[PDB]
Amino acid sequence: HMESADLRALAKHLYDSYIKSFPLTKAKARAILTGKTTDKSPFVIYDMNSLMMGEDKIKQSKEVAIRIFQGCQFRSVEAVQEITEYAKSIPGFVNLDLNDQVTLLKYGVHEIIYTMLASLMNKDGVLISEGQGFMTREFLKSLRKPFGDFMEPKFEFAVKFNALELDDSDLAIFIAVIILSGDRPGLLNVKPIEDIQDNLLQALELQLKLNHPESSQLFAKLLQKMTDLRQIVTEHVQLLQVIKKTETDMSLHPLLQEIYKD
Amino acid sequence: HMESADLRALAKHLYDSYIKSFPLTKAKARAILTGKKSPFVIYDMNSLMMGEDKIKFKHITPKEVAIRIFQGCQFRSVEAVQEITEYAKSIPGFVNLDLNDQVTLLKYGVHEIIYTMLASLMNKDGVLISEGQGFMTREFLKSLRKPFGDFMEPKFEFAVKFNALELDDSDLAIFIAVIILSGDRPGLLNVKPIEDIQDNLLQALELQLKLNHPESSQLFAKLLQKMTDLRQIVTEHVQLLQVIKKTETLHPLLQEIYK
Ligand SMILES: Cc1ccc(COc2cc(C(=O)O)ccc2-c2nn(C(=O)c3c(Cl)cccc3C(F)(F)F)c3ccc(Cl)cc23)cc1
Ligand SMILES: Cc1ccc(COc2cc(C(=O)O)ccc2-c2nn(C(=O)c3c(Cl)cccc3C(F)(F)F)c3ccc(Cl)cc23)cc1
Numbered sequence: 001h002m003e004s005a006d007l008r009a010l011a012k013h014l015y016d017s018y019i020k021s022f023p024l025t026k027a028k029a030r031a032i033l034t035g036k037t038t039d040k041s042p043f044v045i046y047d048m049n050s051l052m053m054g055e056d057k058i059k060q061s062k063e064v065a066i067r068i069f070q071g072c073q074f075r076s077v078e079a080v081q082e083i084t085e086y087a088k089s090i091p092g093f094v095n096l097d098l099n100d101q102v103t104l105l106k107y108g109v110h111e112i113i114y115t116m117l118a119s120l121m122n123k124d125g126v127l128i129s130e131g132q133g134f135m136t137r138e139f140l141k142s143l144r145k146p147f148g149d150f151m152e153p154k155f156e157f158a159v160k161f162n163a164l165e166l167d168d169s170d171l172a173i174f175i176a177v178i179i180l181s182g183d184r185p186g187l188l189n190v191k192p193i194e195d196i197q198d199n200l201l202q203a204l205e206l207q208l209k210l211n212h213p214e215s216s217q218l219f220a221k222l223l224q225k226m227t228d229l230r231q232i233v234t235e236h237v238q239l240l241q242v243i244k245k246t247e248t249d250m251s252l253h254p255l256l257q258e259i260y261k262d
Numbered sequence: 263h264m265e266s267a268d269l270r271a272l273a274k275h276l277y278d279s280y281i282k283s284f285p286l287t288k289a290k291a292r293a294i295l296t297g298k299k300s301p302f303v304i305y306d307m308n309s310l311m312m313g314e315d316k317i318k319f320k321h322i323t324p325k326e327v328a329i330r331i332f333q334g335c336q337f338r339s340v341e342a343v344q345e346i347t348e349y350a351k352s353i354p355g356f357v358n359l360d361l362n363d364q365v366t367l368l369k370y371g372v373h374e375i376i377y378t379m380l381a382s383l384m385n386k387d388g389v390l391i392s393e394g395q396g397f398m399t400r401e402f403l404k405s406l407r408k409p410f411g412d413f414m415e416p417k418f419e420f421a422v423k424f425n426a427l428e429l430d431d432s433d434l435a436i437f438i439a440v441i442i443l444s445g446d447r448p449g450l451l452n453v454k455p456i457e458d459i460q461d462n463l464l465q466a467l468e469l470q471l472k473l474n475h476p477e478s479s480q481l482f483a484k485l486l487q488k489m490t491d492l493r494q495i496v497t498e499h500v501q502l503l504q505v506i507k508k509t510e511t512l513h514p515l516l517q518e519i520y521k
Contacts, residue, residue, distance in 0.1 A: 183487075183491075198479050201480045202480060205483070216263070216461050216465075217461050217464045219483075220486055223483060223486045223487060223490070224490065226490040227489075227490045227493045230493075230494055231494070
C-alpha cells in the first residue's frame with residue numbers, strides 16, 4: 001500500500017520517463033492522424049507506386065514484401081532499445097537480479113511493442129518513419145505469401161485497444177506493469193518483482209480513476225487486454241517460424257534473434 | 263455506479279445461488295484435502311480397479327486404463343456444464359439477454375469455469391472426485407500413457423498457482439459470474455447489456471475482495487490476470503482434446519453426448 005500522494009508521484013515519474021524514452025507519443029500520433037494541420041501531414045503509402053515514391057519523399061533491393069518486413073524488424077529493434085531504456089527508469093527494476101532484468105525484457109518487449117503500435121494505428125493504417133508516412137491496412141493485407149497475414153492481427157487488437165481512449169500518461173504506467181510480470185518463465189526471485197508490480201498496479205488504478213472518472217471499470221478492462229496481447233504475440237511467433245522455414249535466405253537482428261530463442 | 267450496499271446484496275445473492283448449484287463447495291473440499299470418512303485413494307492401477315468397484319462410478323461402459331480415466335473427466339465435465347448453466351440463470355440480468363447470446367456466453371465460458379472450479383478440488387498432490395468420496399493422486403494421473411499424462415498435469419499446474427490466491431466460495435461465486443458475462447465472445451449479437459452486467463459484477467467482486475481480503479493488496483488485479491491466463495490454458499486444452507479425439511480413434515451416440 002502507498003499513500004495516494006506517493007502514487008501520483010510515481011505516475012508523474014513514469015510519464016516523464018516515457019516522454020524521454022519514446023520519441024513518437026500517442027499524443028503526437030493522434031495530431032498527425034487527426035489532421036487539421038499542414039505541417040504534420042504524412043505521405044500515404046497504399047500501393048506499389050506510392051511505396052516507390054515514398055522512398056524519394058519520406059526517405060535494400062528485394063521483393064516488396066521482404067523490404068517492408070525488414071523495415072519492421074529495424075523499427076522493432078529500435079523499439080526494444082527504447083523499451084529497454086524506459087524499463088531502467090522503473091523504480092526497483094535495475095535493482096533486480098540481472099538475470100531477471102533480462103528475462104523481463106525478453107518476454108515483455110513484444111507485448112509492449114504491440115501496445116504502443118496501437119497508438120500509431122487507426123482502422124485504415126499505421127504511421128511509419130516517425131510519423132512522416134502512413135501505410136494503409138489494405139496494402140499490408142495484400143502482401144504475398146505469409147506476409148499479408150502478418151500485419152492484420154496487430155490492427156484487430158489496435159481497434160479494440162484504441163477504444164479504451166488511453167493517453168500517454170496512462171500507457172506509461174500500463175507499460176511498466178507489463179514489464180514487471182512475475183509469471184515470466186525462468187524468473188529467479190518472483191517476490192520483489194511482484195512487489196514492484198503491486199505499486200505500479202496501485203498507481204495505474206488511481207491514475208485511471210482520476211484521468212477517466214466517467215469510465216467505469218476501465219482498470220479491469222485494461223488488464224483484460226493482456227489476453228488479446230498474449231494471443232497476438234503467440235500468433236506472431238508462429239508466423240515467424242513459417243518464414244524461418246520458407247525464407248532461409250533471411251536473417252534477423254541479433255537482438256530479435258536472442259529475444260525469440262526459447 | 264452502484265451503492266456499496268447494493269454490491270453486498272449482489273454478492274450475497276450470488277453466494278447463495280452458487281451454494282445451491284454446485285455439489286462440492288471449495289470449503290468442503292478443503293476440509294477433505296486437509297484431513298480436518300476418509301476418501302478412497304487411487305494411486306495406481308490396482309487401487310483404480312478397486313475404486314471403480316467401491317465407488318459407484320456412472321461412466322463405466324463396455325477400455326484401456328488411461329481411456330477410462332479420460333472418459334471419467336468427460337462425464338464429470340458434462341455434469342459441470344449443466345451445473346454452471348443453472349447457476350448462470352441466477353446472475354441478475356442473464357436470463358433477459360437475447361437467447362442466442364445466453365447460449366454463446368455459456369458455450370465459451372464453461373471451459374474456463376470448469377478449470378477454475380476444478381482448482382477448488384485440487385492440491386499439489388491430487389484431485390477429489392465423486393463428490394469427494396475419492397481422491398486420485400497427481401502422480402498417478404501424470405504417469406498415464408500416450409498424451410494422457412501430459413493432458414492432466416496442466417490442470418494441476420494451474421490449480422497450484424490459482425489456489426495461492428486463497429479465494430473462498432463467496433469470492434469464487436462472483437468471479438465465475440464475471441467470466442460468464444464476457445462481452446468479447448465471438449458471435450455475440452448485443453454486447454452492451456453483457457458489459458453492463460459484467461461492470462456491476464466487477465464492482466461487486468472488487469468490494470468483496472477488499473472486505474474479505476483486506477490484507478491482500480491488489481488481489482482484484484491479480485485475479486483478473488488469472489482470467490487472462492485461463493483463455494490461453496483453455497486454448498491449449500481444446501487443441502489437446504482435438505488430438506486425442508483424432509489419434510485415439512466409441513459409440514456414435516456417446517460421440518454426440520460429448521460433442
Ligand atoms: C516499411 C515499414 C512499415 C511499417 C513500419 C512500422 O512498424 C512498427 C513500428 C513501430 C514503432 O514505430 O514503434 C513498432 C513496431 C512496428 C512493427 N513491428 N512489427 C513486428 O512485430 C515485427 C517484429 Cl517485432 C519482428 C519482425 C517482423 C515484424 C513484422 F513483420 F510484423 F513487422 C509489425 C508488424 C506490422 C506492422 Cl504494420 C508494424 C510492425 C515501419 C516501416
Ligand atoms: C477418473 C476421474 C478423474 C478425475 C475426475 C475429476 O475431474 C473433474 C471434476 C470436476 C468437478 O468435479 O468439478 C470438473 C472437471 C474435471 C476434469 N475435467 N478435465 C478436463 O479435461 C476437462 C476440463 Cl478441465 C474442462 C472441460 C472439459 C474437460 C474434458 F472433457 F476434457 F474432460 C480434467 C482433467 C484432469 C483432471 Cl485431474 C480433472 C478434470 C473424475 C474422474
